[PDB]
Amino acid sequence: NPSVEDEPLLRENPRRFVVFPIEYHDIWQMYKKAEASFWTAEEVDLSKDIQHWEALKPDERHFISHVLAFFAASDGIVNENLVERFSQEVQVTEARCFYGFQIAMENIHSEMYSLLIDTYIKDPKEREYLFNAIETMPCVKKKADWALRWIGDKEATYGERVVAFAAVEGIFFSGSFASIFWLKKRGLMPGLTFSNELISRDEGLHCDFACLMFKHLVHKPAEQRVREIITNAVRIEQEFLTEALPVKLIGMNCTLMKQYIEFVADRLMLELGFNKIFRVENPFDFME
Amino acid sequence: NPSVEDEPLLRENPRRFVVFPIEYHDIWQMYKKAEASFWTAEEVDLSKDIQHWEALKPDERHFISHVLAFFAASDGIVNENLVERFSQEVQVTEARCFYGFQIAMENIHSEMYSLLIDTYIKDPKEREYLFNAIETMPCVKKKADWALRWIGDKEATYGERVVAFAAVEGIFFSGSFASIFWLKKRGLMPGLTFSNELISRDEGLHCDFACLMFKHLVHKPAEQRVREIITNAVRIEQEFLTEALPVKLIGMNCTLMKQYIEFVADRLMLELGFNKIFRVENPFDFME
Ligand SMILES: [Co+2]
Ligand SMILES: [Co+2]
DSSP states (O other), X not given: OOSOTTOTTTXXXXXXXXXXXXXXXXXXXXXXXXXXXXXXXXXSOOTTHHHHHHHSOHHHHHHHHHHHHHHHHHHHHHHHHXXXXXXXXXXXXXXXXXHHHHHHHHHHHHHHXXXXXXXXXXXXXXXXHHHTHHHHOHHHHHHHHHHHHHXXXXXXXXXXXXXXXXXXXXXXXXXXXXXXHHHHHTTOOHHHXXXXXXXXXXXXXHHHHHHHHHHTOSSOOOHHHHHHHHHHHHHHHHHIIIIISOGGGGXXXXXXXHHHHHHHHHHHHHHTTOOOSSOOOOSOGXXX | OOSOTTOTTTSSOOXXXXXXXXXXXXXHHHHHHHHHTXXXXXXXXXXXXXXXXXXXXXXXXXXXHHHHHHHHHHHHHHHHHIIIIIHHHOOOHHHHHHXXXXXXXXXXXXXXXXXXXXXXXXXXXXXXHHHTHHXXXXXXXXXXXXXXXXXXXXXSOHHHHHHHHHHHHXXXXXXXXXXXXXXXXXXXXXXXXXXXXXXXXXXXXXXXXXXXXXXXXXXXXXXXXXXXXXXXXXXXXXXXXXXISOGGGGTOOHHXXXXXXXXXXXXXXXXXXXXXXXXOOOSOGGGO
């Protein structure tokens, strides 16, 4: 804790913790955006996806079940970090409100994903396999540990940690979000694609907020440091979608998927105030 | 941290943090109740209370402004405790979900109260006086410090702390909630009484959950310890409504108000599994 007192975002200068005397309208506006986007899992009708999961092909279910499992855990990893870290560190009221809402929405996301799994896998045995993917699946573990490491890293500053999770919510979900949107295009799994639209939207907002926090940070990682955290996330995600769980299992081109991950990484870099790293176009017309 | 490993609620046995494999339906049900009660401040129309605040009498505005100020802070005190303590300690998924939602609703409550103040006090000078009541007002400080002390108490167990905050959200708000319902009966301040109905309801739910957590606690304070925490809260609250801010300022009988505080304290004791302390009837027919 060196020059932390000079951080408007972290400095212990509240001695207020009131609300309306809003100091940061940009942060508050983000929070209001999130509030108005509130939804509950009960709002997604799954009373019809059981049949769709049947018409599906063996390779497809394999891909989906694995993607869902990866989601059933990730949402939790993010949530823990927000609870025992970010929401603790940040002393700015507006930010605390946004983080408080993000937490609630992440739990709704968790519930949504568990609800999906239960609907498709009625066998309580396979259910446990997917629910404990963090330990039952090595592929999902490489990513789980990556994010988990940023939670227990007592050295990494808030600046590095905020970029790492922006990468988790942005790069680690990008491939899966794109895979689901692809299915929607193919007219498959209405329940899965509908919830995916609400979730992807929330993650996009959570990512934009992360970048906004980064900007309110005075002493933050150097550009090179940011490029490597983001780049490590891109490689991890690409390997996951081209080796561990090839998008070919659902009729997607591995190469195009690789390009999309780089595209998403570049947008994140721009939102953080830096230049692009890969300089590639968005290969998917249904993701713009 | 003696025998904490034997606490199902606190023991670090998650290694799951998934959701649907619900273990405690009673806790989950509480969370679902809270979720369905969601509301935003934007849902309360205040485009008419400015006139009502005028027709009000000098003593009445004095009472209200002071009650609101007490609220603008309390909601924050509770929130901080939930963020840097309860939500941290509890490892049970269902409980974490409820606490995550409580936090979000408390911030909406804060916003609602600040919105009310701004509407009634257009003078930014008096605004600051009420917003920083924790330091600008001694009366509200005695209560603020009481709750604040339970946050920084590194000795008090979760059991004691959970009872203390159940007392804050139940006993410390009781008098003020009753005062507002009294105004509603007198047909005054529609904006204030409407929001009061949504808030009081949420606090009641937050109190019931506190009692439910207490029950899931194996090693908790002895009944005598519970009676004194609750009793200290009753005396503090009574003094506040009969000396610091006499309910007489709004046409209420000090004695009856004293009896209501004791009534509320007794209900809390019953919800915790103990016998009543005061054994008094609810003196207000508009509070049943
Ligand atoms: Co998120
Ligand atoms: Co509350």
